[PDB]
Write a protein that binds this ligand. Structure first.
Ligand code: SF4
Ligand code: SF4
Ligand code: FCO
Ligand code: FCO
Ligand code: SF3
Ligand code: SF3
Ligand code: F3S
Ligand code: F3S
Ligand SMILES: [Cl-]
Ligand SMILES: [Cl-]
Ligand SMILES: [Li+]
Ligand SMILES: [Mg+2]
Ligand SMILES: [Mg+2]
Ligand code: NI
Ligand code: NI
Lengths: 263, 581, 581, 263
């Protein structure tokens, strides 16, 4: 038997679910077929409507205390929670029901971890991260917009293989992938040290891969694995393709000034 | 109960009410209700978007150069398309022209998205409406090999392969942990494929789930990552260096070699796996050429896309045609103007928003996004919707119209516009496809037609990837490397007040972003998105949108099992985050 | 001319002389000469290594910690195995014991090399001796599909696939640029496959050329790069961190996931592509079970490899057994000791080197590498050789012997040693293989048998990769992360004078490095390598080595076309850079 | 018709030939079938002996002045050149004959470019690089032991696509991949600049990916693409897997002191 997993969705753009299916090793196919039992997921499941409600109720009842709850997105507190409606009622009610039976919770992405774009000024829906609503369960935060595909699958395989949650920093992020800054493992750091900077797009410096600090790179304040593990089977990351880090793994990154203003 | 007439339909809310909430195998966040008569035929259909975030509000006061990054997060499924529309809109407002390589690369980004998004929809989202997965356990592996080999040259077809796939599914099911297959519609009488076709289709579902991850490596090379690649106002940030010191720091011959390898593999998969599977669904489900027509024989809309002449958005430049048809008159394809206040307008009389006068429609440069949750009597409470009240406000999606007409957008819409403008390649391709199915042209205006058109667009986009790559390489051979214009990067160079429109064809249909800039900041930012059109609620005349029309008049075999509703809704590829933003 | 008797052969150099120089589809650098009688039968065979570099001289005065990197460059085909032998030798001399995870990772490095080197040999080096590539153009694609599907569950078998491969080959040759196929032996009467089997094997040649690049990703994870990965004295440099800050700087769960994915894919390709093709070659070429026996029914040697108990090189630890057989007595598997001066010795009476007494053999701790180019009374001259003089010195390869006996090493040798020691997995594999061909056990002692044993060993090594990976993960679950011992890393910790032996089984056979350290520097470093054994020249008794013996008594259909000579030589997988170092 | 290529081998270990077949994009299969005509190659060709000699003669005669000569390895001047014998004659005679008809020469690897391991002290065979023997033909040096697979294939695709030789530095190395040092694009540079170093193997610093300078890393004096392009479809490079750079792309790297002594 495989460990039961329930995956729910609040206010979100689906980027973390899409990132998960990009995994190169293990393939998402093999995670679903061999490593976990993905027992509820609105984006992939056959059943809809009353048949999907029956799956949800049956799984959280039969496996009470024993399933992992994956959460993508967040609950809005505005309009009595009716900015996000599921089966006719506020999403927050489904979140609390699912959390009550879970052994542990994975908060995928900056939305579930912190708030992300819907929580940026002026936050019209009062979007609120999972840990401010669910206060009596272990929550592992895996931030990024979205997190790296092979980081997502590595965290899953760690938990299944070792039969334990990853060790975390003071904010609940796994030490393995969030312990160091982007700028502490960046291949352009030689240029930063030398004062060798891109000053305007497509200048001679940009064509030699010089540092993006003066173009607004937020690598120096951002914790993630993009400059080492990289993205999409190791093919690239934002800086390697010529754009500064946005700071997308960090709480409040949308409201720290323009992406093109210096750290 | 009441009844009224609109667009040739009789909308009647007598009879049994059925609710489908959640709709699954979409991004999320949709509710559908219908009424059925004593013959189990739909006489009323209600489309509801069940979430809202408010990106149009969040964008106020941002730097226009940052806008693309915010609006890209409207959606991670159609990832990149909102960034493209944003950079187009800001460049149109300020008066910026980009270098030819930036335009070519942006066209590569959009074609890559079409390939990926259309492929994953066919298998992971719509596929299980047409393939009975559990019935695959009854197939003969040798007969499955024989079927596959009769449809395609694709290498992966051995009897031992299909036996191995079948045994993996058997072991998955045997322990009772059916996962995504639990409590499905398996055995419904509208599943018409033989067991061998169900096994072949399931094997391909799994091949597509693996292969889709490779296509987006093109977005990683030019845009850093997928989902959510990076872009700039003025071009792209991926500077090119082929033959100079430091090419290790830029897009070089090795990076371009990787992109070429992905293009070839992507065309091969779509042409030899997806295309034959789509044609086979057509062969075994011909009655669905007469179900779900909706607005597709009445009113269809395309803005056009893929400018081949850099910074020229006119008819001679756009590789994917734009135009509008209304009142079923396909002999007169009409021109679209996104600045004309009498063309695109949005209504909120049946949506959860405030206007000073809800009986009139607002063009997006006059748009208002003031949320107001007000469901009226829903047979429960404000926090317990048992039955939406479609006589009043029932959705977070606004109601767009074109010259007051309700339109369908997306692959079928685009195919009909190009066909009736006389695009020769389109005419030839459509005629040959319908000939092979032994169906009339009118068979394309249906739920089956939406699926066939999407697959033939994936094929078209995979061919255009090679065309665009070859144009890039031609420029590099001639020493033209530029990827960004920075003459107007600094805000001191901008007009004090200006406005612009950015438009394209996203995988799901016509997309526009309307932006007004004042004193260096965003003053207004309004989006009208393809699923906003298709999933629209009603307007002050009671006119119904594309989803509600396509569900009207449909027979259900088993009212409690909504397979026919799912087939037609999934044929449009709904993106509800896009629809509400 | 002369005639003498040795090892049951009559060595006769009267009659017509044939020269094959260059030997191709090896690493390079071999010359072969034979004499044939009136009946086109080989009566004399001469094996010559035609290059020398002198690594044993270059290593003098180097730091022992550096030696692995120099000797790795003996060979880029068997890349890594000389580094492994080196670190073993230096650790044996100094008295270093490595942590369990370093030993497990070294075993993974060796098993990875066995899988890669054996697979590439089968297709790219030996395959064209058995497959007639031009005859593939005559095959029927449907009959090719049917053949492939009768032999294997491998998915890639459609008629369309085989037609596409056939058309690629047809296009390749249609400009008259035949490349690697130009002036081949196509149509020779010894080509016995039907056209459908030629097309199947050629498709597989191309599949293997593509797939082999993936296997070595395991070397890149643990060793940085392939070819020529990195190692250390004391363990491995690839520090592990699974669950602590900074795991992005080390071997972490994502890196281990990549290794697991390669292992599964490698096992699947070997078991479903290489294994059925090797058996098919056997079915269609059964007479080659009686050709090329040579020394394989007389004298065979293995040192043994893959210690499962860290730092224990004894019989209870080694997963691939060691032992020697002489005089055809397979009932008496003898133990091997690499320190005993009466066991391994090298002679130079027929090689281009100086010894104080060339009539005696020297154990490697007494070894001497003093090059002396002296070909004597050749036909032609010293810089324009027409015929080597095999009565005098004729090669850059030294002549190794074991207790004075000439031995065969490599996959067939190891298989015979393991079989006759009673290894259960070896006995089962061999018995099942020979049963499938309806051939007696003695059929393995042959040119065909060398090929069958190599395929056997690729399957064995792919299974052991999973075993070792699981052992690594079991240690990590228990909190055992260590990868290096550094208490004797600094030179001041070493004995003032010490010596050691490092040994293993490389893909081509028994490998040993003998090292002496004095005053912190290499004082002596002598290598005896598998192809040095098999390609050996003669000794003072006139005893012949494994290649010369396997060529004796071979019938040739066409004297001017050396296909039968190539088949037998290629069956040993010659590495001439290894042989001379 | 495709461009004719003749590939010959002197004193060498075959590592550059093996590197070539590791190419990920384009596949080596596709280079041989569609981009070039690989008309002579002792490691891959069907013909041997007199039949291989006939191929060599026919190609260099019929395509005189029109073929590219690829060279792996180097000629020995000791023992009248008979430390490397081809068709019973010194290898140097085959090199001179092949060079005379070539339009241009590619020196693959440190052996062909500079000498590599056989030329390290005391150089028993008097191994000599190609440009000290052939003085009247263009020679492009592609050094490394071996060079990176996808660098080899990118250089080939450049030459075919653009119909010209790559621009080179003053040593004859292509600027595209040899213009910058390993240490100027190294992802561990942040640790170098902070004084954060591995001091002994498998110490805590090693387990965090600290800089390898004190372990002997020669990245500061070595020009190559290993820290940006990386090895084997981008999977790793020496430093990423925990060993310092040996300096293997540079002339004389074997005789610059121990690999474990600081730069
Ligand atoms: S590009 Fe960004 S992360 Fe990299 S060195 Fe420069 S500032 Fe730091
Ligand atoms: S590991 Fe080597 S190349 Fe990298 S920063 Fe340190 S000294 Fe420089
Ligand atoms: N395609 C797509 Fe998403 C929607 N609807 C956008 O734009
Ligand atoms: N295998 C291999 Fe190479 C040889 N002979 C070594 O050692
Ligand atoms: Fe993956 S849902 Fe996409 S917006 Fe930033 S994390 Fe959220
Ligand atoms: Fe590729 S042959 Fe290998 S030793 Fe250093 S480059 Fe030479
Ligand atoms: S923008 Fe996000 S994806 Fe990585 S490089 Fe910066 S944390
Ligand atoms: S040893 Fe060689 S492979 Fe690259 S990292 Fe240094 S130049
Ligand atoms: Cl946030
Ligand atoms: Cl050198
Ligand atoms: Li030891
Ligand atoms: Mg809007
Ligand atoms: Mg030796
Ligand atoms: Ni979307
Ligand atoms: Ni070798």
């Amino acid at each position: 038997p495989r460990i039961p997993v329930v995956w729910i969705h609040g206010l979100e753009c689906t980027c973390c679910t899409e990132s998960f299916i990009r995994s190169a090793h293990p393939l998402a196919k093999d995670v679903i077929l061999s490593l976990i039992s993905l027992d509820y997921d609105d984006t992939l499941m056959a059943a809809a409507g009353t048949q999907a409600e029956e799956v949800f109720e049956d799984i959280i009842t039969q496996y009470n205390g024993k399933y992992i709850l994956a959460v993508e997105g967040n609950p809005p507190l505005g309009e009595q929670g009716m900015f996000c409606i599921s089966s006719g009622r506020p999403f927050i009610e489904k979140l609390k029901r699912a959390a009550a039976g879970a052994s542990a919770i994975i908060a995928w992405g900056t939305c579930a971890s912190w708030g992300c774009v819907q929580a940026a000024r002026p936050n019209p829906t009062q979007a609120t991260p999972i840990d401010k609503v669910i206060t009596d369960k272990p929550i592992i935060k895996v931030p990024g917009c979205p997190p790296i595909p092979d980081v997502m699958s590595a965290i899953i395989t760690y938990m299944v293989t070792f039969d334990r949650l990853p060790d975390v920093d003071r904010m609940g992020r796994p030490l393995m992938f969030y312990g160091q800054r982007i700028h502490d493992k960046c291949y352009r750091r030689a240029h930063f040290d030398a004062g060798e900077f891109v000053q305007s797009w497509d200048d001679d410096a940009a064509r030699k891969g010089y540092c993006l600090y003066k173009m607004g790179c937020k690598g120096p304040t951002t914790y993630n694995a993009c400059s080492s593990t990289r993205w999409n089977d190791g093919v690239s990351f934002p800086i390697q393709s010529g754009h500064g880090c946005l700071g997308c793994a960090e709480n409040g990154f949308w409201d720290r000034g323009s992406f093109y203003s210096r750290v | 109960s009441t009844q009224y007439e609109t667009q040739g339909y009789t909308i009647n809310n007598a009879g049994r009410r059925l609710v489908v909430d959640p709709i699954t195998r979409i991004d999320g966040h949709m509710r559908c209700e219908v009424n059925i008569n004593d013959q189990n035929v739909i006489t009323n259909a209600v489309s509801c978007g069940t979430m809202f975030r408010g990106l149009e509000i969040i964008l106020q006061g941002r730097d226009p150069r940052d806008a693309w990054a915010f609006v890209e997060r409207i959606c991670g499924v159609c990832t990149g398309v909102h960034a493209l529309a944003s950079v187009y809109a800001i460049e149109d407002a300020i008066g910026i022209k980009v270098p030819d390589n930036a335009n070519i690369i942006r066209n590569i980004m959009l074609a890559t998205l079409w390939c990926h998004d259309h492929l994953v929809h066919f298998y992971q989202l719509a596929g299980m409406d047409w393939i009975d997965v559990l019935d695959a356990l009854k197939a003969d592996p040798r007969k499955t090999s024989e079927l596959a080999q009769s449809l395609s040259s694709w290498p992966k077809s051995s009897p031992g392969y299909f036996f191995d796939v079948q045994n993996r599914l058997k072991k998955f099911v045997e322990g009772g942990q059916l996962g995504i297959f639990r409590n499905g519609y398996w055995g419904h009488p509208q599943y018409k494929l033989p067991p061998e076709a169900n096994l072949m289709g399931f094997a391909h579902y799994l091949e597509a789930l693996d292969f889709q991850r490779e296509i987006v490596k093109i977005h990683a090379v030019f845009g850093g990552k997928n989902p959510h690649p990076n872009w700039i106002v003025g071009g792209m940030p991926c500077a090119i260096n082929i033959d100079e010191s430091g090419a290790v720091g830029a897009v070089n011959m090795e990076r371009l070699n990787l992109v070429q390898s992905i293009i070839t593999r992507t065309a091969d998969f779509i042409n030899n796996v997806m295309i034959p599977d789509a044609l086979a669904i057509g062969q075994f489900n011909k009655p669905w050429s007469e179900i779900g027509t909706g607005l597709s024989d009445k009113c269809v809309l395309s803005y056009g896309a893929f400018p081949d002449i850099a910074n020229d958005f006119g008819e001679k430049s756009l590789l994917m045609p734009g135009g509008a048809v209304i009142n079923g008159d396909f002999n007169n394809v009409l021109p679209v103007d996104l600045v004309d206040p009498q063309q695109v307008q949005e209504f909120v009389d049946h949506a959860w928003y405030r206007y000073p006068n809800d009986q009139v429609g607002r063009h997006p440069f006059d748009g208002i996004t003031d949320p107001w949750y007000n469901p009226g009597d829903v047979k429960g409470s404000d926090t317990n919707i048992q039955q939406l009240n479609e006589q009043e406000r029932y959705s977070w999606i606004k109601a767009p119209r074109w010259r007051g007409n309700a339109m369908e957008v997306g692959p079928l819409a685009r195919t009909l516009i190009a066909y009736h403008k006389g695009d020769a390649a389109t005419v030839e391709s459509v005629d040959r496809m319908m000939s092979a199915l032994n169906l009339p042209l009118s068979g394309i205006q249906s739920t089956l037609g939406r699926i066939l058109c999407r697959a033939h667009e994936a094929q078209w986009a995979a061919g255009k990837l090679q065309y665009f790559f070859d144009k890039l390489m031609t420029n590099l051979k001639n020493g033209n490397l530029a990827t960004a214009s920075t003459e107007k990067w600094e805000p001191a160079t901008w007009p004090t007040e200006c406005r612009g429109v950015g438009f394209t064809e996203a995988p799901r249909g016509a997309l526009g972003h309307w932006a007004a800039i004042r004193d260096g900041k965003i003053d207004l930012y309004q989006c009208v998105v393809p699923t906003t059109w298709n999933a629209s609620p009603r307007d002050p005349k009671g006119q119904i949108g594309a989803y509600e029309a396509a569900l009207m008049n449909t027979k259900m075999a088993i009212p409690e099992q909504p397979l026919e509703i799912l087939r037609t809704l999934h044929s449009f590829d709904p993106c509800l985050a896009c629809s509400t933003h």
